[PDB]
Ligand binder design. Structure first.
Ligand SMILES: Cc1cc2nc3c(=O)[nH]c(=O)nc-3n(C[C@H](O)[C@H](O)[C@H](O)COP(=O)(O)OP(=O)(O)OC[C@H]3O[C@@H](n4cnc5c(N)ncnc54)[C@H](O)[C@@H]3O)c2cc1C
Ligand SMILES: CCCCCCCCO[C@@H]1O[C@H](CO)[C@@H](O)[C@H](O)[C@H]1O
Ligand SMILES: CCCCCCCCO[C@@H]1O[C@H](CO)[C@@H](O)[C@H](O)[C@H]1O
Ligand SMILES: CCCCCCCCO[C@@H]1O[C@H](CO)[C@@H](O)[C@H](O)[C@H]1O
Ligand SMILES: CCCCCCCCO[C@@H]1O[C@H](CO)[C@@H](O)[C@H](O)[C@H]1O
Ligand SMILES: O=S(=O)(O)CCCNC(CO)(CO)CO
Length: 494
C-alpha cells in the first residue's frame, strides 16, 4: 500500500488547490499534470483576484460575494505574488447610467466584507488626463492582482510540503473502477514510461478537458456540458505611468481591462469567443486584436497600433454550460459533481471555477469527499500561508530586507526575487555571497542559481516553464538567450 487515498488529475489552479487541501488533511495525494503546472487556462487569465463586478448585472450574488471575500484570504496567503490594485471605470452614460454604477459599487463594497481594501470613489477627468477630453467622469474601486501561474506553483509546493506527490509531464490515459478501488493509468509524455496506481478517490480537475476525460479516459457520462470560451490578451509597452488599472465599458456591454504589468508593460484584455477544438491550439485572431485596440483607442488619447504589440496570449474558459446564447452571459460560477458506486471509489469532477474562487472550490470538494475518508482532518486553508508567502510585511519591505541581508543584489534583482519567490528566496540564494556565486548570466539578471532552483524546487523541465510560467523573463530574453536556457536544461536534467 502502494494505494493512494486520492488521485487528482489536472495541475492547473483547481487541481493544485484540491490536492493541497487534501494533503493537509492527512490524505495521501498524488496530483498528475500532463505537461507543466498551469500550462493551460491557469496561466492565460487576466491575473485578477476580483469580485466580478460585471456579474452583478446577471444576479450572480453567490459568486460575487464569495469572490469578494476571498480577495483578502488570498492576499494573506500569498502576499509575495498577490497585491491590491485600484480600478478606474470611465463614465459612458449612454451605456450605463451613473445611478446604476453608483449602486453596484455599493454592493461590491459590502457584499463580501473587507477588513482592509479601500472603498469606491468618483473621479473627474480633465484636459490633462490619459483619457480622451470628452470623457469627464468616472469611478474607482478595489480588486487584486495575482501572478496566476505562480499561485498554481505555490499550491503544488504545498502538496509536497504536506507529504503528497506531484508528477508533471505525466498524462493520465485512463481511470476505471475495479473491486472498490480506482485504477489510474498514466504515461510520461517524453519517455513513454507507463504507470498504474490504485486509489480510494479520484478528482477530475482537467479544466477544458473535463468532459473529454469522461469520454476518452473513463468511458463514463459527464454530468455537465462544457462551453469553451476563448479569451485573448495583448501586451504593449506601458500606455501610461499611472499605477491604476482602467476598466472600460465597450458598446457590446462587455468590459475590457487595461492593467499595469511589471512596471514596464500594459496588458489589454479580454474577449469572449466561442471555441471548438484543441484547447492547446488556442491563439489570438485578427478580430480580437482589432476589438481590443478599438476599445482602448476610443477611450485613451495615446493611440496604439498593431505594431506596438510586444506579446499576446490566449486561453479557453472551461465554463459550466448553462446553455446561454451569449458567451459573455454564461455563468462564471463553478459546479462540482460527486459520484460513487456501491458507496466506494468516489469521483469528484470540477466544472468551471475562476482563479479567484479556487480555495473555496477546493474546500467544497473535500467536504464532498469527507464521508469516504476515515479520520480525515478538518478544513484548514483559510489560515495557511502558501510556500513563499512568509514575508512579514509587503513585497516591497521584503525586497528591501533581502538587499539588507544579501547586499550584492541590485535593487532590480532583489525586487524580482521578492515578488517571485518571496520567502523561498533564501533557498534559491543558498550559500551565494557575491553576484559571481549566482553563476551564468542568461540575460536580464536571470542567473544559473535561479534556473537551478527552478528545476530543483519548481518542476521546471523546459525553457517555457521557467521563462513563461514560473517567471515572465521570456518578455526580455532574446531567441538566442532562450535557446541557451534550453541547452542548459538539457545538460542539467540529462
Ligand atoms: C481569458 C481568461 C481570463 C481569465 N481571467 C481571470 C481572472 O482575471 N481572475 C480569475 O479568477 N480567473 C480568470 N480566468 C478563469 C481561470 O483562468 C480559470 O477558471 C482557471 O484557470 C481554471 O483552471 P483549471 O485548473 O480548472 O483548468 P486547468 O488546470 O488550467 O486545465 C487542466 C489542466 O490539467 C492538465 N490536464 C488536462 N487533462 C489531463 C489529463 N488527461 N491527464 C493529466 N493532466 C491533464 C493540463 O495539462 C491542464 O493544464 C480567466 C480565464 C480566461 C480564459
Ligand atoms: C451634463 C451636465 C452635468 C455635468 C456632469 C457630467 C456629465 C456626466 O453625467 C451623466 O450624464 C448622462 C446624460 O448625458 C446621464 O445618463 C448620467 O447618468 C449622468 O451622470
Ligand atoms: C452614495 C452612492 C449611492 C447613490 C444612489 C444612486 C444615486 C446616484 O445618482 C447619480 O449621481 C450623479 C452625481 O450627481 C448624477 O449625475 C446622476 O444624474 C445620478 O443618476
Ligand atoms: C431597466 C433599468 C430601470 C430600472 C427601474 C428603476 C427606475 C429607474 O429610474 C431611475 O432611478 C434613479 C434612482 O434610483 C434616478 O436617479 C434616475 O434619474 C431614474 O431615471
Ligand atoms: C435590486 C437588484 C438589482 C441588481 C442589479 C445590480 C446592478 C449592477 O450593475 C453593475 O454596475 C457596475 C458598476 O458598479 C458595472 O461595472 C457593471 O457592468 C454592472 O453590471
Ligand atoms: O521545494 S518543494 O519541496 O516545495 C518542491 C520540490 C519539488 N522538487 C522536484 C525536484 O525534481 C521538482 O522541482 C520534484 O520532486
Amino acid at each position: 500500500m502502494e494505494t493512494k487515498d486520492l488521485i487528482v488529475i489536472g495541475g492547473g489552479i483547481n487541481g493544485a488547490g484540491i490536492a493541497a487541501d487534501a494533503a493537509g488533511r492527512g490524505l495521501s495525494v498524488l496530483m498528475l499534470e500532463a505537461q507543466d503546472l498551469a500550462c493551460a487556462t491557469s496561466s492565460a487569465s487576466s491575473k485578477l483576484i476580483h469580485g466580478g463586478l460585471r456579474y452583478l448585472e446577471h444576479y450572480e450574488f453567490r459568486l460575487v460575494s464569495e469572490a469578494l471575500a476571498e480577495r483578502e484570504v488570498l492576499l494573506k496567503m500569498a502576499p509575495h505574488i498577490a497585491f491590491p490594485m485600484r480600478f478606474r471605470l470611465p463614465h459612458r452614460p449612454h451605456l450605463r447610467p451613473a445611478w446604476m454604477i453608483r449602486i453596484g459599487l455599493f454592493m461590491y463594497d459590502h457584499l463580501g466584507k473587507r477588513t482592509s481594501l479601500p472603498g469606491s470613489t468618483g473621479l473627474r477627468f480633465g484636459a490633462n488626463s490619459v483619457l480622451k477630453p470628452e470623457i469627464k467622469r468616472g469611478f474607482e474601486y478595489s480588486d487584486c492582482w495575482v501572478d496566476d501561474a505562480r499561485l498554481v506553483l505555490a499550491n503544488a509546493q504545498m502538496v509536497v510540503r504536506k507529504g503528497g506527490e506531484v508528477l508533471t509531464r505525466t498524462r493520465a490515459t485512463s481511470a476505471r473502477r475495479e473491486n472498490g478501488l480506482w485504477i489510474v493509468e498514466a504515461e510520461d509524455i517524453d519517455t513513454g514510461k507507463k504507470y498504474s496506481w490504485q486509489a480510494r478517490g479520484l478528482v477530475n480537475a482537467t479544466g477544458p478537458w473535463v468532459k473529454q476525460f469522461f469520454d476518452d479516459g473513463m468511458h463514463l457520462p459527464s454530468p455537465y456540458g462544457i462551453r469553451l470560451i476563448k479569451g485573448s490578451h495583448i501586451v504593449v509597452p506601458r500606455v501610461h505611468t499611472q499605477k491604476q488599472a482602467y476598466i472600460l465599458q465597450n458598446e457590446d456591454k462587455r468590459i475590457v481591462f487595461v492593467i499595469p504589468w511589471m512596471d514596464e508593460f500594459s496588458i489589454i484584455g479580454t474577449t469572449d469567443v466561442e471555441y471548438k477544438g484543441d484547447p492547446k491550439a488556442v491563439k489570438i485572431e485578427e478580430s480580437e486584436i482589432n476589438y481590443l485596440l478599438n476599445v482602448y483607442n476610443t477611450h485613451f488619447k495615446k493611440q496604439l497600433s498593431r505594431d506596438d504589440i510586444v506579446w499576446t496570449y490566449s486561453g479557453v474558459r472551461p465554463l459550466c454550460d448553462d446553455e446561454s446564447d451569449s458567451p459573455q452571459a454564461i455563468t462564471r460560477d463553478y459546479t462540482l459533481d460527486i459520484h460513487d458506486e456501491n458507496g466506494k471509489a468516489p469521483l469528484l469532477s470540477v466544472f468551471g471555477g475562476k482563479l479567484t474562487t479556487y480555495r473555496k472550490l477546493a474546500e467544497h470538494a473535500l467536504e464532498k469527499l469527507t464521508p469516504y475518508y476515515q479520520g480525515i482532518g478538518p478544513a484548514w486553508t483559510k489560515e495557511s500561508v502558501l510556500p513563499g508567502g512568509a514575508i512579514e510585511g509587503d513585497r516591497d519591505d521584503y525586497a528591501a530586507r533581502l538587499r539588507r541581508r544579501y547586499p550584492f543584489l541590485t535593487e532590480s534583482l532583489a525586487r524580482h526575487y521578492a515578488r517571485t519567490y518571496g520567502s523561498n528566496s533564501e533557498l534559491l540564494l543558498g550559500n551565494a555571497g557575491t553576484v559571481s556565486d549566482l553563476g551564468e548570466d542568461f540575460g536580464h539578471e536571470f542567473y544559473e542559481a535561479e534556473l537551478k532552483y527552478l528545476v530543483d524546487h519548481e518542476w521546471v523541465r523546459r525553457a517555457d516553464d521557467a521563462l513563461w510560467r514560473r517567471t515572465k523573463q521570456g518578455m526580455w530574453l532574446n531567441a538566442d538567450q532562450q535557446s541557451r536556457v534550453s541547452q542548459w536544461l538539457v545538460e542539467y536534467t540529462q
